């Protein structure tokens, strides 16, 4: 029994968590009231991964919602899936951080962290055999970045053998909805590099690009982006819940994807995408899934994988398919694009197959890539961060909450080392000198 505890902090994390729970509830046939009205038998076989059982055959998820302003909690409660959650898990304060990292991690969050940790311990002790945690949040904001990093630190200190994940929305190159974003992104990445086993990098720009170009939507909204991210999140942990011909837990993905401890920043992806009104033209087969999956324009990280090399790749398929087709297609992808795969790993494509595909898709697949191109994101942040730190743009708001300038420098150094470490395994030969 592999139980996952789900946490979500900040406006972005709360919205994504709401959409994710709506999706998973559809997958397992749970009504908004909490009762079960499904059709197949396998849906209840592993419901205990995400849900707890109440008295009258009613199920309640393991969500824990955190914020420092009551607006988003009120929005989520007054919603289609408001009443499914447990009331005692809605932890919140007032007078939120306000895009200020110091308020979130050193001043305001220090009061709410004890209550949040108490609820987390209560929920965790009741599980049969906890596997890992989750956390949805955004790095460009105060409450999200600050409280999320603090929670990650404390939980990692308390439970050191379980698997910590996180789905983080990085700042975008061009589209910007805050001005003090680089400070929050840097002072945070500094903690995520230390206290996490896997991080999946999401960016608004890539998701907007997918919606505008692939799905052909004329008016994308945040619901769609949450949809995409939620589809990926559901796809990642499929093998814990349903049977298959080759299983892969979170820990197997962790072992196979990460060569060294500090290189765990992944580019996620999902296929297929017919954009509607074009399903009749596209024939759905395993080669088509593999073709769309590796395309540079399908990624949600806003990094071009052609500018680097793939350290490792993982593909989780969901459906009824032949194993020979999967193995041959992965071999062909490796051979035809040999320039973009590192040479000192003889084979760097993990594969898994599950038997139960999604609601209305004969077949589906999800992608977890690990390549050096992700370094560009960090580099871009540094190229902004120093530009604001040489002349101390907005620093007094941070030092007013008790944070010595040294903390800022101790970080720009850490991220710069991360970029350098990735840059080492990037050149496509190493000899002579």
């Amino acid at each position: 029994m592999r139980e996952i505890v789900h946490i979500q902090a900040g406006q972005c994390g709360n919205q994504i968590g709401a959409k994710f729970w709506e999706v998973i509830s559809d997958e397992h046939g749970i009504d908004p009231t909490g009762s079960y009205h499904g059709d197949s038998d396998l849906q209840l076989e592993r419901i205990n991964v995400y849900y707890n059982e109440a008295t009258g055959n009613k199920y309640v998820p393991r969500a824990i919602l955190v914020d420092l302003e009551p607006g988003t909690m009120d929005s989520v409660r007054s919603g289609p899936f408001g009443q499914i959650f447990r009331p005692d898990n809605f932890v919140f304060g007032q007078s939120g951080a306000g895009n200020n990292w110091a308020k979130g991690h050193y001043t305001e969050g220090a009061e709410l962290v004890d209550s949040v940790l108490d609820v987390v311990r209560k929920e965790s002790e009741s599980c049969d055999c906890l596997q890992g945690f989750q956390l949805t949040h955004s790095l460009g904001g105060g409450t999200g970045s600050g409280m999320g990093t603090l929670l990650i630190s404390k939980i990692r200190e308390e439970y050191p053998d379980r698997i910590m994940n996180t789905f983080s929305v990085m700042p975008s190159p061009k589209v910007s909805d805050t001005v003090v974003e680089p400070y929050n992104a840097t002072l945070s990445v500094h903690q995520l590099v230390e206290n996490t086993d896997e991080t999946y990098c999401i960016d608004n720009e890539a998701l907007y690009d997918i919606c505008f170009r692939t799905l052909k939507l004329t008016t994308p909204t945040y619901g769609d982006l949450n949809h995409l991210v939620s589809a990926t999140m559901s796809g990642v942990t499929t093998c814990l819940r349903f049977p298959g011909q080759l299983n892969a837990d979170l820990r197997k993905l962790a072992v196979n994807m990460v060569p060294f401890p500090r290189l765990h920043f992944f580019m996620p992806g999902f296929a297929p995408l017919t954009s509607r009104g074009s399903q009749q033209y596209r024939a759905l087969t395993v080669p088509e899934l593999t073709q769309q999956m590796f395309d540079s324009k399908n990624m949600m990280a806003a990094c071009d994988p052609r500018h680097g090399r793939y350290l490792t790749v993982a593909a989780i398929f969901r459906g009824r398919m032949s194993m020979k087709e999967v193995d041959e297609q992965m071999l062909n992808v490796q051979n035809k694009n040999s320039s973009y795969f590192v040479e000192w790993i003889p084979n760097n494509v993990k594969t898994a197959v599950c038997d139960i595909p999604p609601r209305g898709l004969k077949m589906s697949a999800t992608f977890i890539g690990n390549s050096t191109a992700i370094q560009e994101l960090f580099k871009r942040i540094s190229e902004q961060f120093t530009a604001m730190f040489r002349r101390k743009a907005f620093l007094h708001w941070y030092t007013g909450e008790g944070m010595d300038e040294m903390e800022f420098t101790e970080a720009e150094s850490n991220m710069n080392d991360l970029v350098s470490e990735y840059q080492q395994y990037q050149d496509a030969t190493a000899d002579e000198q």
Binding site: G71, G98, N99, V175, V179, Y208, E383, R390
Partner: protein, 451 residues
Amino acid sequence: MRECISIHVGQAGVQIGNACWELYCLEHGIQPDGQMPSDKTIGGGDDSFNTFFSETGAGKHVPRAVFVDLEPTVIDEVRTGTYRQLFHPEQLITGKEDAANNYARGHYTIGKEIIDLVLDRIRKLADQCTGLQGFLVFHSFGGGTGSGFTSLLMERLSVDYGKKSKLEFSIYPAPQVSTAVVEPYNSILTTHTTLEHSDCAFMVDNEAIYDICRRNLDIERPTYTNLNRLISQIVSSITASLRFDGALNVDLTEFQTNLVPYPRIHFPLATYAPVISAEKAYHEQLSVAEITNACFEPANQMVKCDPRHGKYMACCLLYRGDVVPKDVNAAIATIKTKRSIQFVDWCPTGFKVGINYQPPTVVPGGDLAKVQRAVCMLSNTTAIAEAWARLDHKFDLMYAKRAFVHWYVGEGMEEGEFSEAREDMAALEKDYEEVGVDSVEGEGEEEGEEY
């Protein structure tokens, strides 16, 4: 609970408060008598938003406002107007003379004996709030009361509460048109206190509003009511983030964290893009890109200064109505590629975005057309220094001969304050000059693995 306290000092302050409270009662469906029939008909709701209004047991709603002025006439008007029953009868009006366009009279001589009552009533209002956000102070530079009394108030509130944000809306003397002879003195004097004690002072000129009204609204004879209505619309746009749901909400702390680089630079400009008459409301799309572009134009600026002569340090955009994020994204991308808009090299990001679902309302008897989309821009830039520099010259021309100085000294002030003041205004301009310069060269870029 997101509450905030409104203060109105001086004649300009109380007329702006009149327009403001008219607008807010219209937004919340509250009758001028204080009753709300919407809840009675529906049977219950959150329409009695606790931000501006406190709800009593009988169902009446009283505003979280404190009017103050030394002239009984301007508030005897509202004690016998339409909204006579909306306000609590304790209004804190002095039955004496006025500052008479004298900072010294309003600060030292007559400012006492009325200060105490104002702090007790502000204390009583503050005690009723749970998680107060801050103060919105309305007043006008140049007036004796609105300068001196506002300075004394600002000092006492800073001493007492301290950590609460205290925003300010003010009316600056225009370059050319003026209504008094001693405006520069009272300005140069209250700048010293508005620099230290305020946290973010919004700045508005009358001539800019006259030009905006003449050009866009096609009103050839505007009066103070239209100006107050525009200012009220701006304040509504600022505060709507913590009254209605939205996709991206912007609280009052985010304002200051995102718009104030250094502690002494907190003087942004304000603009409202879709200002247009009902007749011209047709024949136009009023898409998001159009209003976003119209915000940046020099003509629509609400203070008589050219943005093209400075550099933008920060921008806050606050949208209302049918707005989706992708249109704002595209508009920002389009603005960033224009060369006439220069951003400083130490702010690569530049922008803050906030979206609200509640569209703007239309006041009966007004002039603004009903629109589906609206936006308010708050830009922190270096051009503002020019608007200061002009006034200073006049004060020096007034000071070199020591004209009209015996009136100020007779009320209890000394000459060195006039002197000390000029120095303070003199520096602030220096700081605004330094922040606008580009980075030097970095002082680096050395060789390395040359082997």
